[PDB]
Amino acid sequence: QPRKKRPEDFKFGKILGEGSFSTVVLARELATSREYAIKILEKRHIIKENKVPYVTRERDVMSRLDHPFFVKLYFTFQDDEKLYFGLSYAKNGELLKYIRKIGSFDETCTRFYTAEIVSALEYLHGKGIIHRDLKPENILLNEDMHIQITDFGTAKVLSSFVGTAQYVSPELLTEKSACKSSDLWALGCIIYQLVAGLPPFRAGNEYLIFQKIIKLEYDFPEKFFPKARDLVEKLLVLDATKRLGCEEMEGYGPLKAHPFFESVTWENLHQQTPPKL
Ligand SMILES: Nc1n[nH]c2ccccc12
Numbered sequence: 685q686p687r688k689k690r691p692e693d694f695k696f697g698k699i700l701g702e703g704s705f706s707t708v709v710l711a712r713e714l715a716t717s718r719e720y721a722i723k724i725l726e727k728r729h730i731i732k733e734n735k736v737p738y739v740t741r742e743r744d745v746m747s748r749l750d751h752p753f754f755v756k757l758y759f760t761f762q763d764d765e766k767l768y769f770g771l772s773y774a775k776n777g778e779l780l781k782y783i784r785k786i787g788s789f790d791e792t793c794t795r796f797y798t799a800e801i802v803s804a805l806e807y808l809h810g811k812g813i814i815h816r817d818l819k820p821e822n823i824l825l826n827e828d829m830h831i832q833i834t835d836f837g838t839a840k841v842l843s844s845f846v847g848t849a850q851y852v853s854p855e856l857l858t859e860k861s862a863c864k865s866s867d868l869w870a871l872g873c874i875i876y877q878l879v880a881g882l883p884p885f886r887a888g889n890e891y892l893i894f895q896k897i898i899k900l901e902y903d904f905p906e907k908f909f910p911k912a913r914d915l916v917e918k919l920l921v922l923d924a925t926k927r928l929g930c931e932e933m934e935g936y937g938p939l940k941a942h943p944f945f946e947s948v949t950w951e952n953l954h955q956q957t958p959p960k961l
Pocket residue numbers: 700701708721755771772773774775777824834
Protein backbone atom coordinates (compact mmCIF):
# COMPACT_ATOMS: atom_id res chain seq x y z
CA GLN A 685 0.00 0.00 0.00
CA PRO A 686 1.10 3.61 -0.78
CA ARG A 687 1.85 6.29 1.82
CA LYS A 688 -1.46 7.40 3.34
CA LYS A 689 -3.16 10.16 1.34
CA ARG A 690 -4.01 13.59 2.71
CA PRO A 691 -6.34 16.56 2.00
CA GLU A 692 -3.63 18.49 0.15
CA ASP A 693 -3.54 15.68 -2.42
CA PHE A 694 -6.96 16.85 -3.54
CA LYS A 695 -8.75 19.71 -5.18
CA PHE A 696 -12.11 19.74 -3.40
CA GLY A 697 -15.22 20.85 -5.26
CA LYS A 698 -18.99 20.66 -4.96
CA ILE A 699 -20.90 19.03 -2.13
CA LEU A 700 -22.51 15.76 -3.27
CA GLY A 701 -24.50 14.97 -0.14
CA GLU A 702 -25.12 16.04 3.44
CA GLY A 703 -26.11 14.01 6.47
CA SER A 704 -26.19 14.62 10.21
CA PHE A 705 -22.74 13.14 10.75
CA SER A 706 -21.14 13.49 7.34
CA THR A 707 -20.74 15.57 4.21
CA VAL A 708 -19.78 14.06 0.87
CA VAL A 709 -17.62 16.28 -1.35
CA LEU A 710 -16.54 15.69 -4.93
CA ALA A 711 -12.75 15.91 -5.09
CA ARG A 712 -10.13 15.59 -7.82
CA GLU A 713 -6.87 13.84 -6.96
CA LEU A 714 -4.03 15.99 -8.33
CA ALA A 715 -1.46 13.30 -9.17
CA THR A 716 -3.95 11.18 -11.14
CA SER A 717 -6.75 13.56 -12.18
CA ARG A 718 -9.21 10.98 -10.75
CA GLU A 719 -12.56 12.04 -9.33
CA TYR A 720 -13.49 10.52 -5.95
CA ALA A 721 -16.46 11.22 -3.71
CA ILE A 722 -14.90 11.85 -0.31
CA LYS A 723 -17.14 11.32 2.72
CA ILE A 724 -16.01 13.70 5.47
CA LEU A 725 -16.91 12.97 9.09
CA GLU A 726 -16.14 15.15 12.10
CA LYS A 727 -14.61 13.14 14.94
CA ARG A 728 -15.87 15.38 17.73
CA HIS A 729 -19.43 15.21 16.46
CA ILE A 730 -19.22 11.41 16.16
CA ILE A 731 -17.79 10.87 19.64
CA LYS A 732 -20.14 13.43 21.19
CA GLU A 733 -23.16 11.56 19.78
CA ASN A 734 -22.02 7.97 20.39
CA LYS A 735 -21.70 7.08 16.71
CA VAL A 736 -18.24 5.50 16.73
CA PRO A 737 -19.75 2.04 16.36
CA TYR A 738 -21.75 3.22 13.34
CA VAL A 739 -18.79 4.80 11.58
CA THR A 740 -16.65 1.78 12.44
CA ARG A 741 -19.30 -0.54 10.97
CA GLU A 742 -19.66 1.53 7.79
CA ARG A 743 -15.94 1.22 7.02
CA ASP A 744 -15.74 -2.46 7.86
CA VAL A 745 -18.73 -3.32 5.65
CA MET A 746 -17.41 -1.25 2.76
CA SER A 747 -14.06 -3.02 3.01
CA ARG A 748 -15.82 -6.36 2.50
CA LEU A 749 -17.54 -5.31 -0.73
CA ASP A 750 -16.03 -6.06 -4.12
CA HIS A 751 -18.86 -5.80 -6.61
CA PRO A 752 -19.78 -3.44 -9.50
CA PHE A 753 -23.20 -2.56 -8.02
CA PHE A 754 -21.78 -1.18 -4.81
CA VAL A 755 -19.91 2.01 -3.98
CA LYS A 756 -16.23 1.18 -3.56
CA LEU A 757 -14.06 2.44 -0.72
CA TYR A 758 -10.68 3.25 -2.27
CA PHE A 759 -8.87 4.81 0.70
CA THR A 760 -9.14 6.42 4.12
CA PHE A 761 -7.12 9.02 5.97
CA GLN A 762 -7.58 11.52 8.77
CA ASP A 763 -6.36 14.82 10.12
CA ASP A 764 -6.93 16.40 13.55
CA GLU A 765 -10.65 17.04 13.26
CA LYS A 766 -11.98 14.81 10.47
CA LEU A 767 -12.13 11.36 8.86
CA TYR A 768 -12.00 10.96 5.07
CA PHE A 769 -13.41 8.05 3.05
CA GLY A 770 -12.50 7.93 -0.63
CA LEU A 771 -15.61 6.56 -2.33
CA SER A 772 -16.64 5.76 -5.91
CA TYR A 773 -18.19 8.77 -7.64
CA ALA A 774 -21.61 8.14 -9.18
CA LYS A 775 -21.75 10.86 -11.83
CA ASN A 776 -25.48 10.52 -12.60
CA GLY A 777 -26.80 10.90 -9.06
CA GLU A 778 -29.74 9.26 -7.32
CA LEU A 779 -32.32 6.90 -8.81
CA LEU A 780 -34.99 9.04 -7.17
CA LYS A 781 -33.95 11.88 -9.48
CA TYR A 782 -34.86 9.79 -12.52
CA ILE A 783 -38.13 8.61 -11.02
CA ARG A 784 -39.15 12.26 -10.60
CA LYS A 785 -37.66 13.29 -13.93
CA ILE A 786 -39.63 10.83 -16.06
CA GLY A 787 -42.48 10.21 -13.62
CA SER A 788 -42.44 6.41 -13.71
CA PHE A 789 -40.49 3.66 -15.46
CA ASP A 790 -41.79 1.42 -18.22
CA GLU A 791 -41.57 -2.38 -18.06
CA THR A 792 -38.14 -2.73 -19.67
CA CYS A 793 -36.41 -0.15 -17.48
CA THR A 794 -38.23 -1.43 -14.42
CA ARG A 795 -37.23 -5.00 -15.25
CA PHE A 796 -33.59 -4.07 -15.86
CA TYR A 797 -33.05 -1.85 -12.82
CA THR A 798 -34.98 -4.15 -10.50
CA ALA A 799 -32.84 -7.07 -11.68
CA GLU A 800 -29.66 -5.10 -10.87
CA ILE A 801 -31.00 -4.37 -7.40
CA VAL A 802 -31.94 -8.03 -6.89
CA SER A 803 -28.51 -9.10 -8.12
CA ALA A 804 -26.85 -6.61 -5.77
CA LEU A 805 -28.90 -7.77 -2.78
CA GLU A 806 -28.02 -11.37 -3.53
CA TYR A 807 -24.35 -10.42 -3.28
CA LEU A 808 -24.81 -8.34 -0.16
CA HIS A 809 -26.86 -11.01 1.58
CA GLY A 810 -24.43 -13.73 0.55
CA LYS A 811 -21.88 -11.94 2.72
CA GLY A 812 -24.24 -11.92 5.70
CA ILE A 813 -24.77 -8.19 5.43
CA ILE A 814 -28.03 -6.28 5.75
CA HIS A 815 -28.44 -2.73 4.42
CA ARG A 816 -31.44 -1.75 6.59
CA ASP A 817 -32.15 1.52 4.81
CA LEU A 818 -32.46 0.67 1.12
CA LYS A 819 -34.26 3.29 -1.00
CA PRO A 820 -33.99 5.21 -4.31
CA GLU A 821 -31.86 7.90 -2.61
CA ASN A 822 -29.26 5.29 -1.64
CA ILE A 823 -29.25 3.78 -5.13
CA LEU A 824 -26.91 5.87 -7.23
CA LEU A 825 -26.39 5.76 -10.97
CA ASN A 826 -22.95 5.53 -12.49
CA GLU A 827 -21.73 7.42 -15.55
CA ASP A 828 -22.74 4.40 -17.62
CA MET A 829 -26.14 4.28 -15.90
CA HIS A 830 -25.60 1.09 -13.88
CA ILE A 831 -26.57 1.23 -10.18
CA GLN A 832 -24.16 1.77 -7.31
CA ILE A 833 -25.67 1.16 -3.90
CA THR A 834 -24.35 3.35 -1.10
CA ASP A 835 -24.75 4.50 2.52
CA PHE A 836 -23.73 1.57 4.71
CA GLY A 837 -23.59 3.51 7.96
CA THR A 838 -26.85 1.91 9.08
CA ALA A 839 -25.86 -1.58 7.87
CA LYS A 840 -25.59 -4.62 10.13
CA VAL A 841 -23.37 -7.68 9.77
CA LEU A 842 -25.11 -10.84 10.96
CA SER A 843 -23.66 -12.90 13.82
CA SER A 844 -31.76 -0.92 17.40
CA PHE A 845 -32.18 1.67 14.64
CA VAL A 846 -35.03 2.57 12.28
CA GLY A 847 -34.60 3.40 8.58
CA THR A 848 -36.62 5.76 6.37
CA ALA A 849 -40.31 5.65 7.29
CA GLN A 850 -41.79 4.70 3.91
CA TYR A 851 -39.45 1.71 3.45
CA VAL A 852 -39.59 0.37 7.03
CA SER A 853 -40.72 -3.25 7.30
CA PRO A 854 -43.54 -4.38 9.61
CA GLU A 855 -41.25 -6.42 11.84
CA LEU A 856 -39.18 -3.34 12.69
CA LEU A 857 -42.30 -1.59 14.00
CA THR A 858 -43.34 -4.64 16.00
CA GLU A 859 -40.12 -6.27 17.27
CA LYS A 860 -37.14 -3.91 16.86
CA SER A 861 -35.53 -6.78 14.94
CA ALA A 862 -34.36 -6.89 11.32
CA CYS A 863 -33.04 -9.45 8.84
CA LYS A 864 -32.42 -10.01 5.13
CA SER A 865 -36.18 -9.90 4.57
CA SER A 866 -36.21 -6.24 5.63
CA ASP A 867 -34.22 -5.36 2.52
CA LEU A 868 -36.61 -7.51 0.49
CA TRP A 869 -39.54 -5.61 1.93
CA ALA A 870 -37.75 -2.41 0.95
CA LEU A 871 -37.29 -3.93 -2.51
CA GLY A 872 -41.03 -4.41 -3.00
CA CYS A 873 -41.55 -0.76 -2.10
CA ILE A 874 -38.92 0.36 -4.63
CA ILE A 875 -40.37 -1.83 -7.38
CA TYR A 876 -43.86 -0.48 -6.68
CA GLN A 877 -42.32 3.00 -6.83
CA LEU A 878 -40.60 2.45 -10.18
CA VAL A 879 -43.87 1.33 -11.78
CA ALA A 880 -46.30 3.66 -10.02
CA GLY A 881 -44.13 6.73 -9.49
CA LEU A 882 -44.71 6.82 -5.73
CA PRO A 883 -43.97 4.60 -2.70
CA PRO A 884 -46.75 2.16 -1.68
CA PHE A 885 -47.32 3.62 1.80
CA ARG A 886 -47.92 7.38 1.97
CA ALA A 887 -49.57 9.59 4.59
CA GLY A 888 -49.61 12.93 6.39
CA ASN A 889 -46.94 11.93 8.90
CA GLU A 890 -44.65 9.15 10.11
CA TYR A 891 -47.20 7.72 12.53
CA LEU A 892 -49.89 7.38 9.87
CA ILE A 893 -47.37 5.68 7.60
CA PHE A 894 -46.39 3.16 10.23
CA GLN A 895 -50.08 2.44 10.69
CA LYS A 896 -50.58 1.61 7.02
CA ILE A 897 -47.44 -0.53 6.91
CA ILE A 898 -48.49 -2.91 9.69
CA LYS A 899 -52.03 -2.90 8.30
CA LEU A 900 -50.61 -3.62 4.85
CA GLU A 901 -52.77 -0.74 3.65
CA TYR A 902 -51.84 0.13 0.06
CA ASP A 903 -53.08 -0.72 -3.42
CA PHE A 904 -52.05 -0.90 -7.07
CA PRO A 905 -52.90 1.62 -9.82
CA GLU A 906 -55.04 0.34 -12.69
CA LYS A 907 -52.15 0.18 -15.16
CA PHE A 908 -49.57 -1.60 -12.97
CA PHE A 909 -47.70 -4.28 -14.94
CA PRO A 910 -49.45 -7.54 -13.90
CA LYS A 911 -46.28 -9.63 -13.52
CA ALA A 912 -44.61 -6.84 -11.53
CA ARG A 913 -47.67 -6.59 -9.31
CA ASP A 914 -47.52 -10.30 -8.61
CA LEU A 915 -43.86 -9.94 -7.67
CA VAL A 916 -44.63 -7.03 -5.35
CA GLU A 917 -47.42 -8.99 -3.67
CA LYS A 918 -44.87 -11.74 -2.94
CA LEU A 919 -42.47 -9.24 -1.31
CA LEU A 920 -44.83 -6.97 0.62
CA VAL A 921 -45.85 -9.78 2.94
CA LEU A 922 -46.25 -9.08 6.66
CA ASP A 923 -44.81 -12.40 7.75
CA ALA A 924 -41.14 -11.84 6.94
CA THR A 925 -40.59 -15.60 6.53
CA LYS A 926 -42.87 -15.72 3.50
CA ARG A 927 -41.11 -13.02 1.46
CA LEU A 928 -39.80 -14.11 -1.93
CA GLY A 929 -36.02 -14.19 -1.65
CA CYS A 930 -35.51 -14.99 2.03
CA GLU A 931 -34.02 -18.21 3.43
CA GLU A 932 -37.31 -19.86 4.42
CA MET A 933 -38.47 -19.42 0.84
CA GLU A 934 -35.19 -20.96 -0.36
CA GLY A 935 -33.40 -17.77 -1.31
CA TYR A 936 -32.66 -15.98 -4.55
CA GLY A 937 -33.27 -18.82 -6.97
CA PRO A 938 -37.05 -18.64 -6.76
CA LEU A 939 -36.94 -14.81 -6.73
CA LYS A 940 -34.70 -14.55 -9.81
CA ALA A 941 -36.97 -17.13 -11.46
CA HIS A 942 -40.11 -15.00 -11.13
CA PRO A 943 -41.96 -14.52 -14.44
CA PHE A 944 -41.42 -10.76 -14.19
CA PHE A 945 -37.74 -11.43 -14.86
CA GLU A 946 -38.34 -13.89 -17.68
CA SER A 947 -36.09 -12.15 -20.20
CA VAL A 948 -33.33 -11.29 -17.71
CA THR A 949 -29.84 -12.74 -18.13
CA TRP A 950 -28.55 -12.70 -14.56
CA GLU A 951 -24.89 -13.60 -15.12
CA ASN A 952 -23.56 -10.38 -16.69
CA LEU A 953 -26.03 -7.57 -15.91
CA HIS A 954 -23.17 -5.16 -15.30
CA GLN A 955 -21.89 -5.88 -18.82
CA GLN A 956 -25.20 -5.06 -20.53
CA THR A 957 -26.35 -1.73 -21.94
CA PRO A 958 -29.16 -0.27 -19.80
CA PRO A 959 -32.41 0.71 -21.53
CA LYS A 960 -32.57 4.46 -22.24
CA LEU A 961 -34.69 6.51 -19.84
N1 LIG B 1 -22.47 11.13 -6.14
C1 LIG B 1 -21.84 10.23 -5.35
N2 LIG B 1 -20.89 9.37 -5.73
N3 LIG B 1 -20.59 8.70 -4.61
C2 LIG B 1 -21.30 9.09 -3.52
C3 LIG B 1 -21.26 8.63 -2.22
C4 LIG B 1 -22.13 9.27 -1.37
C5 LIG B 1 -22.97 10.29 -1.79
C6 LIG B 1 -22.99 10.73 -3.09
C7 LIG B 1 -22.12 10.10 -3.97
